[PDB]
């Protein structure tokens, strides 16, 4: 009826004060959690660098204690996951997506200490994983905890506070409030029905958790005749997005064969992967890590074309292994790394081929940063605003879109699925079937 | 659950037909906008050029400025009152209605009425913004192609309408992202799921922006300074509802002067239109789209009293031009009001807090989109628009905080989304 619309239109954007205020506490706790996590990852990563000083002269021993420290922290991580919270392996983002569909439980009393001390091990182990995973999952749970702790009722209360937690989490993981908001109202939220997620509360929670992050952690241009080059980048990003999704899902299966569910086969498998990272963290330190390290070095062009081909392959290999194996840790930040490295590499070719454009590989590096998100995750808008939050190069805002849409078109037409949805569907299907 | 799994698997699979058609809506909407943009620029140019010839006689050039902006205005109000009454004022709520399937899109009538009617009002110097026109025209262009090619389904009717209205916004502010965010935040049906394809909206926006491109750094903000941005929002949040009353209230009052009668309406439209050409010479800051004075206000050039004047004046003139139902937006006008109120707020904080080492111009940026925060209640879209237009990233948090302050206090002082009130006004009168 037209009569209900009028009633609805006039009563629009009135969120209850008790939910708004609780969004403020959620945000304050998520940002705190997020920071503590971050600090602990840094501390451990460091201790490990300090071990390679006390064994600096003996090179075989050096390479041994590079493997063992990480393998021990990974193993300690997988153990917390398998023994206490199997829901808290992998990213965590899909497991919250479900909780918003009301299809997956939010076991905060379990996931919080697991995901936190688990990722602390795997990330501190120097694995190729993000902070987004642990912070988004924890975020949602921190929102779920204060729902239950104040036994607040209603669908608005439950989705709003479960969304502001998840958004506040990402904001902290990238010092990026806007990306948090857009991530909620683009990828996270229930995609096929209406929901009562209050965006104002999401605004509050994001603000608080960014402030908490701030308290303890304080390119050229692109003319028209150059635009088609960003389309192409995107196309190439779109053909490879599904391929990457298929490998990560493929590799999910091909590693379940190695341990068949067995807690001790799994932990030991993790141990050898986590150890492989600690090792590559020394002998080849760009092939390991969550991948942030090399975004500014690649945006310049201090890397050569040879080294770029090398990193991209190695990082793909090592992103799959760490994530496909179901370690606690994201794939979001490593996709920014992969996105940059490839975009850089394209920009370098583009520079030498078309001198009449007077290119800078660094624009293609910035266009390509949030492109693999657009193709694998199918959340282009967030990756564009995240990367525009971090680097803002405005003159690039059109190139950055064209590339994103290009990859989002070719992710569809080449038979790719959104990567978080594909994992949730896997998890609902494995559960039912 | 089993239905959800079936949905997860089939997600983001927009019919290739709609994605192609979006790329024609955008192209068409972009050209439409650019043509409009060019036309308005041509008429502002004539009104200026006819003051060059009549340079002598102080009280003569006042009268020819008056009559030109009154004659162009009358032409505007008439085209709306004769052939497309639905296409007077903003046009955004009328498209918001259309997405809810509660209003019709008479593109065959509205495209020429808005395009030329706008040409009249905007080109007269009235306090109106190209969004209103380019957005409404945007959806209509997008509905025309649906009709002309005979695309079926609810997905196509909603998508091609949205992607049109979006490409419309992006061609008015060279702001693709702002255009996309406005759909998902403000335009799309607020209380139910719809089948609007974001991907289609991207395509339209891009193609639209390209058409516009084909034919066409403030200091940081320390932590201990963030509360000043909360207060600014608080000031905006109590003021937006009040300015909202006056938009609605002055629509009711300005009705009583003509009673509905096309002739008294069109004459009164010449009086208001005529004022803006008269004020547009003798004090250009109180007239026009507002994009004139925004970069001049961010440098902190205007004295205090000059801003207080410019504010009170532009409240008065914005209201009259928009509330009288003249074709044109209130989106741009609100950017310029906020940008002013911001700079005023900042200048007082500069002298009150020398130990913050403030630059008034950051408070300009923070308060630029912060009347769209309280009046029209689309912070996310505004915040991004400003960021697109200034890309002053370092102020992104102050910009969010002000925005929130404006949206909270607007809510807790009884205010409502100014566009959704205007639609409810229509529909509620449509059942009586």
């Amino acid at each position: 009826r037209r009569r209900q619309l009028i009633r609805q239109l006039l009563e629009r954007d009135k969120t209850p004060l008790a939910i708004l205020f609780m969004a403020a506490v959620v945000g304050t706790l998520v940002g705190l959690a997020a920071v503590a996590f971050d600090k602990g990852v840094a501390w451990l990563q460091n201790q490990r660098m300090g071990a390679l000083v006390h064994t600096a002269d003996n090179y075989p021993l050096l390479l041994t204690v590079a493997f063992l420290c990480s393998a021990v922290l990974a193993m300690f991580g997988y153990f917390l996951v398998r023994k206490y919270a199997p829901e808290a392996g992998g990213s965590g983002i899909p497991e919250i997506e479900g909780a918003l569909e009301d299809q997956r439980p939010v076991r905060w009393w379990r996931v919080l200490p697991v995901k936190f001390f688990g990722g602390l091990g795997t990330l501190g182990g120097g694995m190729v994983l993000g902070r987004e995973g642990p912070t988004v999952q924890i975020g949602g749970n921190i929102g779920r905890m204060v729902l239950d702790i104040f036994r607040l009722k209603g669908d608005e209360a439950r989705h709003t506070l479960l969304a502001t937690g998840a958004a506040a989490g990402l904001a902290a993981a990238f010092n990026a409030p806007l990306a948090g908001i857009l991530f909620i109202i683009e990828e996270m939220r229930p995609q096929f029905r209406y929901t009562l997620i209050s965006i104002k509360a999401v605004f509050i929670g994001v603000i608080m958790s960014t402030i908490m992050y701030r308290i303890f952690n304080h390119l050229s241009d692109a003319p028209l005749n150059t635009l088609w080059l960003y389309l192409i980048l995107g196309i190439i990003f779109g053909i490879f997005g599904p391929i990457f999704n298929k490998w990560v899902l493929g590799m999910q299966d091909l590693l379940h064969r190695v341990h068949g569910g067995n807690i001790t086969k799994w932990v030991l498998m993790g141990g050898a992967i986590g150890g492989l990272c600690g090792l590559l963290g020394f002998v080849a330190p760009a092939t390991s890590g969550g991948g942030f390290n090399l975004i500014p070095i690649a945006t310049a062009g201090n890397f050569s074309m040879g080294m770029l081909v090398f990193i991209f392959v190695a990082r793909v290999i090592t992103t799959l292994l760490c994530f496909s194996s179901g370690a606690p840790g994201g794939i979001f930040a490593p996709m920014l790394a992969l996105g940059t490295v490839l975009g850089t590499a394209f920009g370098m070719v583009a520079v030498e081929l078309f001198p009449q454009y007077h290119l800078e590989a660094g624009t293609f590096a910035i266009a390509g940063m949030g492109a693999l998100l657009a193709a694998s995750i199918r959340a282009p808008l967030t990756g564009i605003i995240l990367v525009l939050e971090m680097t803002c190069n405005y003159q690039l805002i059109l190139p950055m879109i064209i590339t994103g849409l290009g990859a989002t078109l070719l992710a569809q037409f080449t038979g790719g699925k959104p990567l978080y949805s594909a994992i949730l569907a896997r998890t609902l299907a494995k559960q039912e079937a | 659950r089993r239905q959800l799994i079936r949905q997860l698997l089939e997600r983001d699979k927009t019919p290739l037909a709609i994605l192609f058609m979006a790329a024609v809506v955008g192209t068409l909407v972009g050209l439409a906008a650019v043509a409009f943009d060019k036309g308005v620029a041509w008429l502002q140019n004539q009104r200026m050029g006819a003051l060059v010839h009549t340079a002598d006689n102080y009280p003569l050039l006042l009268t020819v400025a008056f009559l030109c902006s009154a004659v162009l205005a009358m032409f505007g109000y008439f085209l709306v009152r004769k052939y497309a009454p639905e296409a007077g004022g903003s046009g955004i709520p009328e498209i918001e209605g259309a997405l809810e399937d509660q209003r019709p899109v008479r593109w065959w009538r509205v495209l020429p009425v808005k395009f030329f009617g706008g040409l009249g009002t905007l080109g007269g110097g009235m306090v109106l913004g190209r969004e209103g026109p380019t957005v409404q025209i945007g959806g209509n262009i997008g509905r025309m192609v649906l009709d002309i090619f005979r695309l079926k389904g609810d997905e196509a009717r909603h998508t091609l309408l949205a992607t049109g209205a979006a490409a419309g916004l992006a061609a008015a502010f060279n702001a693709p992202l702002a255009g996309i965010l406005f759909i998902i935040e403000e335009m799309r049906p607020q209380f139910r799921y719809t089948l609007i394809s974001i991907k289609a909206v991207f395509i339209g926006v891009i193609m639209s922006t390209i058409m516009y491109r084909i034919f066409n750094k403030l200091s940081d903000a320390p932590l201990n300074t963030l509360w000043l941005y909360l207060i600014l929002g608080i000031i905006f949040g109590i003021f937006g509802p009040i300015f909202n009353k006056w938009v609605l209230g002055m629509q009711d009052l300005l009705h009583r002067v003509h009673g509905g009668n096309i002739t008294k309406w069109v004459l009164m439209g010449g009086a208001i239109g005529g004022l803006c050409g008269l004020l547009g010479f003798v004090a250009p800051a109180t007239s026009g789209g507002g994009f004139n004075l925004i970069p001049i206000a961010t440098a902190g050039n205007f004295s205090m009293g000059m801003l207080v004047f410019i504010f009170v004046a532009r409240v008065i003139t914005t209201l009259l031009c928009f509330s009288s139902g003249a074709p044109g937006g209130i989106f741009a006008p609100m950017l310029a009001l906020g940008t002013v109120l911001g700079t005023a707020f900042g200048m007082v904080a500069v002298e009150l807090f020398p130990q913050y080492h403030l630059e008034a111009g950051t408070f300009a940026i923070a308060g630029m989109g912060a009347l769209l925060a309280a009046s029209i209640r689309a912070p996310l879209t505004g915040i991004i628009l400003v960021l697109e237009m200034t890309c002053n990233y370092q102020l992104i948090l102050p910009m969010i905080i002000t925005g929130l302050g404006a949206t909270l206090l607007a809510q807790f002082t009884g205010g409502k989304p100014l566009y959704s009130a205007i639609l409810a006004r229509t529909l509620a009168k449509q059942e009586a």
């Epitope: - | 932590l223 201990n224 130990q355 913050y356 080492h357």
Partner: antibody, heavy 120, light 107 residues
Amino acid sequence: VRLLESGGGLVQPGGSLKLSCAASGFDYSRYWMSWVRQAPGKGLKWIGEINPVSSTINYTPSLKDKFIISRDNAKDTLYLQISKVRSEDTALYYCARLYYGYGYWYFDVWGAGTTVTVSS
Amino acid sequence: DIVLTQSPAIMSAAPGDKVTMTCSASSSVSYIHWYQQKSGTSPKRWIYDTSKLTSGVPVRFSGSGSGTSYSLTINTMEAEDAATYYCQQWSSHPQTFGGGTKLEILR
């Protein structure tokens, strides 16, 4: 990051001098610049500051034209003019670049100093 | 304007000693900074927003205090800390420095 100041030495009581400070190794504009002086074996006294575009120039408590700070961003140079000079003004004149943590400002990198000797 | 007064004017300590010096303010202040001035050298920013070390400053250094009283402490002092240390607030305008505390070494 180098801040090298100059133009000090001997001034007669009542005259004046232009101290300058040449910045290098950083985007000079973007920064508020300031002068601080230190009389023989004594404390540090702020003299004034100046924002990048020279639209805000604050001094310590002093007479209207005693001090005149300025800056020229195309040279990356700060200036300090001192008039009606008296032995109170004999001191080492440091030029320092400003910045903040949480937002409570501070004197970030300091120059080597120039000595001004008020003497006939 | 705010007067900061630095409690020990000249202190002395054998390396190994824990050393503490004070900065008492006439009115209330917040987030004060400390500078370091060795003979012949210009002041170097040392500690800022009350307890943050400038990058480069060894961990033996710390700061604290609030309202009207602030310390900077050297937990096990070394001989290479021999210097005159100025505190300084700019929570109020104009900013203002202490009169210093000159640390001397016993050997």
